[PDB]
Amino acid sequence: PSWPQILGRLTDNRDLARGQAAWAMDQIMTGNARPAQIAAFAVAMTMKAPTADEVGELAGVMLSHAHPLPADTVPDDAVDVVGTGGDGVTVNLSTMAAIVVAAAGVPVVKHGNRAASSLSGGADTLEALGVRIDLGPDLVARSLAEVGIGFCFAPRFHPSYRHAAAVRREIGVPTVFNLLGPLTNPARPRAGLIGCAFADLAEVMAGVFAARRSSVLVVHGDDGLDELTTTTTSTIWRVAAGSVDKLTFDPAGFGFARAQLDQLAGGDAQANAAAVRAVLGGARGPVRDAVVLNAAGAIVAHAGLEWLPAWEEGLRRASAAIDTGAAEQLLARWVRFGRQ
Amino acid sequence: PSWPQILGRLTDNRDLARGQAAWAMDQIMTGNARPAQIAAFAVAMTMKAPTADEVGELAGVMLSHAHPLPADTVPDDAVDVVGTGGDGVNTVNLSTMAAIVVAAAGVPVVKHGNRAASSLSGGADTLEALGVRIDLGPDLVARSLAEVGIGFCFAPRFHPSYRHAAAVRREIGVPTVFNLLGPLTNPARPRAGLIGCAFADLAEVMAGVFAARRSSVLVVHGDDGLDELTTTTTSTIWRVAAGSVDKLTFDPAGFGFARAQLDQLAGGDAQANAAAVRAVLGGARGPVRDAVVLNAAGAIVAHAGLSEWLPAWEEGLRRASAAIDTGAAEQLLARWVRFGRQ
Ligand SMILES: Cc1ccc(C(=O)O)c(Nc2c(C)cccc2S(C)(=O)=O)c1
Ligand SMILES: O=P(O)(O)OC[C@H]1O[C@H](OP(=O)(O)OP(=O)(O)O)[C@H](O)[C@@H]1O
Ligand SMILES: O=P(O)(O)OC[C@H]1O[C@H](OP(=O)(O)OP(=O)(O)O)[C@H](O)[C@@H]1O
Ligand SMILES: [Mg+2]
Ligand SMILES: [Mg+2]
Ligand SMILES: [Mg+2]
Ligand SMILES: [Mg+2]
């Protein structure tokens, strides 16, 4: 195996052989790959049109180098709530959804990161709320048990990935690496709500989760958002029993009104943090509807471990988690945990 | 203009706008591009399938940064003989040998060259072994061409700013659009030449660049895989003339050449390849001679195109053969070596 071999096969518009993608990623995750080599592989992989197997191999190598949590500290039915990002458009729907879902009794372990293209990101907003994001495996495990939620800071759990992260910021363009985020949660939850900004690559991610036999809903808003949108219909690749099925989704059937895309606008960590306190404070509006919708999506995924009645219960549990104030309190206990 | 803009448009598989490829190359040449950005741009440009316009812009930027030769020192009918390389076949240095023969036939040759990348010995390496001084500067290369009839432009001496792209090319290994630039960026800027291309899908692109320059060039690719006019089989020739390109297929059998085996054209290190040159110029008959005479003749046909197809090849094959048989080629090499030590 070598760089000329692998890179040459891609430029010829051919799919890689089994195991070649793994080799390339291991060279990167061990510091035996110069930036030039990293960039060439990332671009070539993207333009060739990657397969589920190829992307699956990349994520597998990252997890094998990642810091794991202590044995038997992660529940069997833990869920993730995270997106690829890079939609170009907003408030932190995934982070807000995560708090609600956790408060509803579903164990959540988020694997997030700072912003890359947006004015603010998930981890950035959590830091602005006083949450300690840079905790080690032992403490993340304690947090999950004592609070009901844990946050895995990618740079701390994937320290060997820093070389690849540097190259990404230099080339600046979206690549296959932009898909690896949701696919490399070090806690390894078996369920989650996974957003994808790239419509022509969502089916691929769904394939990767299908191989792991996970219960996941890969979602893409017809308006382009990497979330379950309320401004129009959405596409959903439901993953269950290792089987993917493509379906169109419309929340208007449940009773959600249509919203404009500007009504879901956001800003910096300070402004987005305020949007979190507002929604968790019980404020109604288009932002709330987006959070409840996504939170329900994560609960439907959790249940996958009927279709319509699952959404009804999901929407019901999500709303109640907010209105009782359980979501607001859970956040407070999350902060106090870090200070102790 | 920015890297995200350019790289984004290429990954979406769209052709660039005017000046974008040019902006990209200038950033690389001025040392303002990160190695990762250089690699991303090279690979993206290749997989999209580049156009004659785009490849043309890159070569234009390189030539603008290159060291020029003095004014009115290069004949208007000077020719080049050089290939992309990277054919993956370790052969004797046919372009270099052919270049000497063409020069000896009375056609001024100014050769763009460099050391080997994948092979054991490149043109520059072999010339060094023969005692030829390749490290000459602009003023001295012009003298050589005038006094000897041939001059050698060593790429890194004339293209010092290309060094950033050079280091990246070696780190990634895979061939890209950058592999096409060498034959396209001869600093003497000859209006004719025989250009070898190892990549069949890109040969038509190189011909488009020369056509835009209104040059008389034969872009050649052996159907066996060589970046030369081969003797083992037919060869695909993109005939560039009058701003137009015409794809043709050349068959040496039509001119009484014998089919050879590729192993007969094999080479080795610098010391070995140097000896191979002395053999052919010495008048040794065989498959290597036939290859050199054909490529030499090809360059003469391109030269005549600056002003009939079959009749031109006939005349071309006469002058190439005669250039060796009279010993002019052997004499020109020796005088070339003496010039360096003087
Ligand atoms: C100054 C210069 C200009 C051009 C080239 C080239 O490869 O064409 C070049 N390559 C090169 C050379 C000759 C020697 C050593 C290292 C390199 S590198 C690390 O740059 O590839 C150096
Ligand atoms: O456009 P970007 O610059 O790439 O930002 C998108 C953010 O969303 C992703 O995580 P996550 O979905 O969990 O954050 P979210 O709450 O905003 O959705 C990603 O980690 C980014 O932080
Ligand atoms: O190492 P490679 O990448 O495989 O290329 C072999 C040689 O051919 C090219 O020039 P040129 O055609 O002028 O030299 P030549 O006489 O051998 O043909 C290149 O500059 C190398 O010197
Ligand atoms: Mg998200
Ligand atoms: Mg999003
Ligand atoms: Mg050659
Ligand atoms: Mg060659």
GROMACS .gro file of N, CA, C and O in nm, chain A residues 69-121:
model
  212
   69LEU      N    1  -1.446   0.554   2.679
   69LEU     CA    2  -1.495   0.571   2.815
   69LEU      C    3  -1.473   0.441   2.892
   69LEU      O    4  -1.462   0.335   2.832
   70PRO      N    5  -1.465   0.450   3.026
   70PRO     CA    6  -1.448   0.330   3.109
   70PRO      C    7  -1.554   0.223   3.080
   70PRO      O    8  -1.663   0.256   3.033
   71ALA      N    9  -1.520   0.098   3.106
   71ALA     CA   10  -1.609  -0.014   3.074
   71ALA      C   11  -1.742  -0.004   3.148
   71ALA      O   12  -1.746   0.026   3.267
   72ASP      N   13  -1.850  -0.030   3.075
   72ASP     CA   14  -1.984  -0.035   3.132
   72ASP      C   15  -2.022   0.094   3.205
   72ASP      O   16  -2.068   0.091   3.319
   73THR      N   17  -2.002   0.207   3.138
   73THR     CA   18  -2.043   0.337   3.190
   73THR      C   19  -2.140   0.406   3.095
   73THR      O   20  -2.201   0.507   3.129
   74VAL      N   21  -2.153   0.351   2.974
   74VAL     CA   22  -2.244   0.404   2.873
   74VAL      C   23  -2.365   0.311   2.858
   74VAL      O   24  -2.348   0.194   2.825
   75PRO      N   25  -2.487   0.363   2.882
   75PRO     CA   26  -2.607   0.280   2.864
   75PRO      C   27  -2.619   0.222   2.723
   75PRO      O   28  -2.566   0.279   2.628
   76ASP      N   29  -2.690   0.111   2.712
   76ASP     CA   30  -2.706   0.042   2.585
   76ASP      C   31  -2.791   0.122   2.486
   76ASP      O   32  -2.778   0.106   2.365
   77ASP      N   33  -2.877   0.209   2.540
   77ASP     CA   34  -2.972   0.283   2.458
   77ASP      C   35  -2.940   0.433   2.453
   77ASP      O   36  -3.030   0.515   2.435
   78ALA      N   37  -2.813   0.468   2.467
   78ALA     CA   38  -2.772   0.608   2.457
   78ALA      C   39  -2.790   0.658   2.314
   78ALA      O   40  -2.779   0.580   2.219
   79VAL      N   41  -2.818   0.787   2.299
   79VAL     CA   42  -2.841   0.847   2.168
   79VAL      C   43  -2.750   0.966   2.142
   79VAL      O   44  -2.707   1.034   2.236
   80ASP      N   45  -2.721   0.991   2.015
   80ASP     CA   46  -2.645   1.108   1.973
   80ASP      C   47  -2.736   1.204   1.897
   80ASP      O   48  -2.831   1.162   1.832
   81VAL      N   49  -2.706   1.333   1.906
   81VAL     CA   50  -2.777   1.434   1.830
   81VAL      C   51  -2.676   1.533   1.773
   81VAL      O   52  -2.623   1.617   1.846
   82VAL      N   53  -2.650   1.522   1.643
   82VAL     CA   54  -2.542   1.598   1.581
   82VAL      C   55  -2.554   1.596   1.429
   82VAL      O   56  -2.610   1.503   1.372
   83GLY      N   57  -2.502   1.700   1.364
   83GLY     CA   58  -2.506   1.711   1.220
   83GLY      C   59  -2.369   1.735   1.160
   83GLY      O   60  -2.273   1.766   1.230
   84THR      N   61  -2.360   1.719   1.028
   84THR     CA   62  -2.236   1.743   0.956
   84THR      C   63  -2.203   1.892   0.955
   84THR      O   64  -2.086   1.931   0.960
   85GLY      N   65  -2.307   1.975   0.950
   85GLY     CA   66  -2.289   2.118   0.939
   85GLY      C   67  -2.255   2.157   0.797
   85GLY      O   68  -2.275   2.078   0.704
   86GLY      N   69  -2.205   2.279   0.779
   86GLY     CA   70  -2.166   2.326   0.647
   86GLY      C   71  -2.285   2.349   0.556
   86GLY      O   72  -2.275   2.333   0.435
   87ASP      N   73  -2.399   2.386   0.615
   87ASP     CA   74  -2.518   2.419   0.538
   87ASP      C   75  -2.509   2.561   0.484
   87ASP      O   76  -2.572   2.595   0.384
   88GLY      N   77  -2.431   2.645   0.552
   88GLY     CA   78  -2.411   2.782   0.511
   88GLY      C   79  -2.513   2.877   0.571
   88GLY      O   80  -2.491   2.998   0.578
   89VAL      N   81  -2.625   2.821   0.617
   89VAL     CA   82  -2.732   2.901   0.675
   89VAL      C   83  -2.712   2.917   0.825
   89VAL      O   84  -2.707   3.029   0.877
   90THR      N   85  -2.765   2.960   1.154
   90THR     CA   86  -2.888   2.942   1.230
   90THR      C   87  -2.858   2.914   1.377
   90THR      O   88  -2.742   2.903   1.417
   91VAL      N   89  -2.964   2.901   1.456
   91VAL     CA   90  -2.951   2.867   1.597
   91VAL      C   91  -2.905   2.721   1.609
   91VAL      O   92  -2.912   2.645   1.512
   92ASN      N   93  -2.856   2.683   1.727
   92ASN     CA   94  -2.806   2.548   1.749
   92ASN      C   95  -2.919   2.449   1.781
   92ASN      O   96  -2.945   2.419   1.897
   93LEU      N   97  -2.985   2.399   1.677
   93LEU     CA   98  -3.098   2.308   1.695
   93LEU      C   99  -3.057   2.177   1.762
   93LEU      O  100  -3.127   2.128   1.850
   94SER      N  101  -2.943   2.122   1.720
   94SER     CA  102  -2.899   1.992   1.769
   94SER      C  103  -2.865   1.996   1.918
   94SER      O  104  -2.901   1.905   1.993
   95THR      N  105  -2.797   2.102   1.961
   95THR     CA  106  -2.760   2.116   2.102
   95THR      C  107  -2.883   2.135   2.189
   95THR      O  108  -2.895   2.073   2.295
   96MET      N  109  -2.975   2.221   2.145
   96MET     CA  110  -3.099   2.243   2.218
   96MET      C  111  -3.180   2.114   2.226
   96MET      O  112  -3.234   2.079   2.331
   97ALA      N  113  -3.188   2.044   2.113
   97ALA     CA  114  -3.260   1.917   2.107
   97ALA      C  115  -3.200   1.816   2.204
   97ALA      O  116  -3.273   1.740   2.267
   98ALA      N  117  -3.068   1.817   2.215
   98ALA     CA  118  -2.997   1.723   2.302
   98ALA      C  119  -3.036   1.740   2.448
   98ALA      O  120  -3.054   1.642   2.521
   99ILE      N  121  -3.049   1.865   2.492
   99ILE     CA  122  -3.085   1.895   2.630
   99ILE      C  123  -3.226   1.845   2.660
   99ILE      O  124  -3.249   1.782   2.764
  100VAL      N  125  -3.318   1.873   2.569
  100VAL     CA  126  -3.458   1.832   2.584
  100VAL      C  127  -3.471   1.680   2.592
  100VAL      O  128  -3.539   1.627   2.680
  101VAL      N  129  -3.404   1.611   2.501
  101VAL     CA  130  -3.409   1.465   2.495
  101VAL      C  131  -3.352   1.402   2.623
  101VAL      O  132  -3.407   1.306   2.675
  102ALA      N  133  -3.241   1.458   2.671
  102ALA     CA  134  -3.179   1.411   2.795
  102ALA      C  135  -3.273   1.430   2.914
  102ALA      O  136  -3.283   1.343   3.001
  103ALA      N  137  -3.339   1.545   2.918
  103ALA     CA  138  -3.433   1.577   3.025
  103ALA      C  139  -3.556   1.487   3.020
  103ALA      O  140  -3.626   1.471   3.120
  104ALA      N  141  -3.582   1.429   2.903
  104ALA     CA  142  -3.698   1.342   2.885
  104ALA      C  143  -3.669   1.199   2.930
  104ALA      O  144  -3.758   1.114   2.928
  105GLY      N  145  -3.545   1.173   2.970
  105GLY     CA  146  -3.507   1.044   3.025
  105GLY      C  147  -3.427   0.955   2.931
  105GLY      O  148  -3.393   0.842   2.967
  106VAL      N  149  -3.397   1.005   2.812
  106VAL     CA  150  -3.316   0.931   2.716
  106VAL      C  151  -3.169   0.967   2.733
  106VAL      O  152  -3.133   1.084   2.720
  107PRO      N  153  -3.083   0.868   2.762
  107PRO     CA  154  -2.941   0.902   2.780
  107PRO      C  155  -2.878   0.961   2.654
  107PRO      O  156  -2.886   0.899   2.548
  108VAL      N  157  -2.817   1.078   2.667
  108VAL     CA  158  -2.753   1.145   2.554
  108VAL      C  159  -2.604   1.161   2.578
  108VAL      O  160  -2.562   1.202   2.687
  109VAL      N  161  -2.524   1.128   2.477
  109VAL     CA  162  -2.381   1.156   2.480
  109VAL      C  163  -2.342   1.224   2.349
  109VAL      O  164  -2.329   1.159   2.245
  110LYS      N  165  -2.327   1.356   2.355
  110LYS     CA  166  -2.296   1.434   2.236
  110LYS      C  167  -2.147   1.431   2.203
  110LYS      O  168  -2.062   1.435   2.292
  111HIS      N  169  -2.118   1.424   2.074
  111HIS     CA  170  -1.982   1.436   2.023
  111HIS      C  171  -1.975   1.555   1.929
  111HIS      O  172  -1.995   1.541   1.808
  112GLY      N  173  -1.948   1.672   1.985
  112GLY     CA  174  -1.951   1.796   1.910
  112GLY      C  175  -1.815   1.860   1.895
  112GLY      O  176  -1.713   1.803   1.935
  113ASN      N  177  -1.813   1.979   1.837
  113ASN     CA  178  -1.690   2.053   1.814
  113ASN      C  179  -1.720   2.202   1.802
  113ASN      O  180  -1.837   2.242   1.801
  114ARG      N  181  -1.616   2.284   1.793
  114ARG     CA  182  -1.633   2.427   1.774
  114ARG      C  183  -1.682   2.456   1.632
  114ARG      O  184  -1.689   2.366   1.549
  115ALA      N  185  -1.715   2.582   1.606
  115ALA     CA  186  -1.763   2.622   1.474
  115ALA      C  187  -1.651   2.619   1.371
  115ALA      O  188  -1.534   2.632   1.406
  116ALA      N  189  -1.688   2.600   1.245
  116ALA     CA  190  -1.593   2.596   1.135
  116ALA      C  191  -1.630   2.698   1.028
  116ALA      O  192  -1.543   2.767   0.974
  117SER      N  193  -1.759   2.708   0.999
  117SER     CA  194  -1.811   2.801   0.899
  117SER      C  195  -1.917   2.893   0.958
  117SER      O  196  -1.933   3.007   0.914
  118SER      N  197  -1.988   2.844   1.059
  118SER     CA  198  -2.094   2.921   1.123
  118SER      C  199  -2.036   3.023   1.220
  118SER      O  200  -1.919   3.014   1.259
  119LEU      N  201  -2.117   3.121   1.258
  119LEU     CA  202  -2.076   3.223   1.353
  119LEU      C  203  -2.056   3.162   1.491
  119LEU      O  204  -1.976   3.211   1.571
  120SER      N  205  -2.130   3.055   1.519
  120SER     CA  206  -2.119   2.984   1.645
  120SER      C  207  -2.156   2.837   1.627
  120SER      O  208  -2.235   2.803   1.538
  121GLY      N  209  -2.099   2.751   1.710
  121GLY     CA  210  -2.123   2.608   1.702
  121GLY      C  211  -2.179   2.553   1.832
  121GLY      O  212  -2.206   2.628   1.925
   0.00000   0.00000   0.00000
